[PDB]
Design a binder for these strands. Structure first.
Length: 85
DNA sequence: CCTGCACAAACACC
DNA sequence: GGTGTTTGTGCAGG
Protein backbone atom coordinates (compact mmCIF):
# COMPACT_ATOMS: atom_id res chain seq x y z
CA UNK A 1 0.00 0.00 0.00
CA UNK A 2 1.47 3.38 -1.02
CA UNK A 3 0.58 6.64 0.75
CA UNK A 4 0.36 9.56 -1.71
CA UNK A 5 1.86 12.92 -0.71
CA UNK A 6 -0.57 15.84 -0.80
CA UNK A 7 0.48 19.36 -1.92
CA UNK A 8 1.52 21.95 0.71
CA UNK A 9 -1.44 24.01 1.95
CA UNK A 10 -1.44 27.57 0.52
CA UNK A 11 -1.82 30.72 2.64
CA UNK A 12 -5.59 30.65 2.05
CA UNK A 13 -6.05 26.94 2.82
CA UNK A 14 -4.01 27.31 6.04
CA UNK A 15 -5.89 30.54 6.91
CA UNK A 16 -9.22 28.84 6.09
CA UNK A 17 -8.51 25.74 8.20
CA UNK A 18 -8.61 27.89 11.36
CA UNK A 19 -10.98 30.58 9.99
CA UNK A 20 -13.34 27.95 8.52
CA UNK A 21 -13.76 26.36 11.98
CA UNK A 22 -14.24 29.82 13.55
CA UNK A 23 -17.14 30.53 11.17
CA UNK A 24 -18.60 27.04 11.69
CA UNK A 25 -18.78 27.48 15.48
CA UNK A 26 -20.42 30.90 15.00
CA UNK A 27 -22.31 29.61 11.94
CA UNK A 28 -22.65 25.83 12.56
CA UNK A 29 -25.79 25.61 10.37
CA UNK A 30 -24.30 27.45 7.38
CA UNK A 31 -23.24 25.09 4.57
CA UNK A 32 -19.54 25.14 3.61
CA UNK A 33 -20.69 26.19 0.14
CA UNK A 34 -21.88 29.54 1.51
CA UNK A 35 -19.16 29.92 4.16
CA UNK A 36 -16.53 29.27 1.50
CA UNK A 37 -18.06 32.23 -0.38
CA UNK A 38 -18.03 34.65 2.59
CA UNK A 39 -14.49 33.62 3.59
CA UNK A 40 -13.32 34.40 0.05
CA UNK A 41 -15.08 37.78 0.30
CA UNK A 42 -13.49 38.45 3.71
CA UNK A 43 -10.11 37.05 2.58
CA UNK A 44 -10.01 39.53 -0.31
CA UNK A 45 -10.43 42.38 2.22
CA UNK A 46 -7.33 41.53 4.32
CA UNK A 47 -4.28 43.76 3.69
CA UNK A 48 -0.92 42.37 2.52
CA UNK A 49 0.67 43.12 5.90
CA UNK A 50 -2.13 41.18 7.61
CA UNK A 51 -1.95 38.42 4.96
CA UNK A 52 1.88 38.36 5.10
CA UNK A 53 1.94 36.32 8.38
CA UNK A 54 -0.20 33.66 6.62
CA UNK A 55 1.90 33.70 3.43
CA UNK A 56 5.15 33.25 5.36
CA UNK A 57 3.64 30.27 7.22
CA UNK A 58 2.52 28.68 3.93
CA UNK A 59 6.04 29.36 2.69
CA UNK A 60 7.47 27.66 5.81
CA UNK A 61 5.06 24.72 5.42
CA UNK A 62 6.20 24.48 1.78
CA UNK A 63 9.90 24.49 2.72
CA UNK A 64 9.34 22.04 5.60
CA UNK A 65 7.13 19.94 3.30
CA UNK A 66 10.02 19.94 0.79
CA UNK A 67 12.38 18.75 3.52
CA UNK A 68 10.22 15.68 4.17
CA UNK A 69 10.05 14.88 0.42
CA UNK A 70 12.94 16.70 -1.34
CA UNK A 71 12.20 14.75 -4.55
CA UNK A 72 8.44 15.40 -4.55
CA UNK A 73 7.09 16.83 -7.82
CA UNK A 74 3.66 18.29 -8.61
CA UNK A 75 2.29 16.12 -11.43
CA UNK A 76 -1.37 16.97 -12.22
CA UNK A 77 -3.53 14.54 -14.22
CA UNK A 78 -4.52 15.90 -17.63
CA UNK A 79 -8.04 15.12 -18.92
CA UNK A 80 -8.75 14.26 -22.55
CA UNK A 81 -8.70 17.71 -24.18
CA UNK A 82 -8.17 18.49 -27.88
CA UNK A 83 -8.67 22.05 -29.19
CA UNK A 84 -9.56 22.56 -32.91
CA UNK A 85 -6.93 24.09 -35.24
C1' DC B 1 7.09 35.17 -22.19
C1' DC B 2 2.07 34.48 -21.49
C1' DT B 3 -2.24 31.68 -20.61
C1' DG B 4 -4.94 27.78 -18.57
C1' DC B 5 -5.60 23.37 -16.19
C1' DA B 6 -5.47 20.27 -12.20
C1' DC B 7 -5.29 19.97 -7.13
C1' DA B 8 -4.48 21.27 -1.78
C1' DA B 9 -8.34 21.09 2.97
C1' DA B 10 -13.01 21.24 5.43
C1' DC B 11 -18.30 20.41 5.78
C1' DA B 12 -23.64 20.17 5.08
C1' DC B 13 -26.78 17.88 2.06
C1' DC B 14 -28.92 13.85 -0.70
C1' DG C 1 -19.68 8.72 -1.49
C1' DG C 2 -20.39 12.34 -4.28
C1' DT C 3 -22.14 17.16 -4.56
C1' DG C 4 -20.95 22.22 -4.22
C1' DT C 5 -17.85 26.16 -2.55
C1' DT C 6 -13.47 29.25 -1.46
C1' DT C 7 -8.13 31.00 -2.76
C1' DG C 8 -3.35 30.13 -4.17
C1' DT C 9 0.56 26.93 -6.37
C1' DG C 10 3.18 24.56 -10.11
C1' DC C 11 3.62 22.57 -14.78
C1' DA C 12 2.76 22.32 -19.82
C1' DG C 13 1.91 24.31 -24.52
C1' DG C 14 2.75 27.59 -28.30
Amino acid sequence: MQDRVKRPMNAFIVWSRDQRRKMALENPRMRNSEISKQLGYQWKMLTEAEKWPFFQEAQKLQAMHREKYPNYKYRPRRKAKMLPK
